[PDB]
Amino acid sequence: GSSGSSGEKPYSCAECKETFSDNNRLVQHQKMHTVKSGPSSG
């Protein structure tokens, strides 16, 4: 019962290797990679 490397999705990321059952999630995740507002959290 987790969210990662579990199941096959039509939306995959060739950058971080993340899956997204829904495009919407991927779309927002794509841009999330290029952020120029605030620094990481750590």
Q: Is 14 one of the binding residues for Zn ion (CB under 5 A)?
A: no
From candidates 1, 2, 4, 16, binder to Zn ion by CB under 5 A: 16
DSSP reduced 3-state for 35: coil
Q: What is the dihedral of CA 28, 32, 34, 38, to 10 degrees?
A: 140
32 binds Zn ion (CB under 5 A): no
Query: Interface with Zn ion includes 27 (CB under 5 A)?
Result: no
Residue nearer to Zn ion on the CB measure, 16 or 37: 16
Alpha-carbon distance of 5 to 10, in angstroms, equals 13
Binding site for Zn ion (CB under 5 A): 13, 15-16, 18
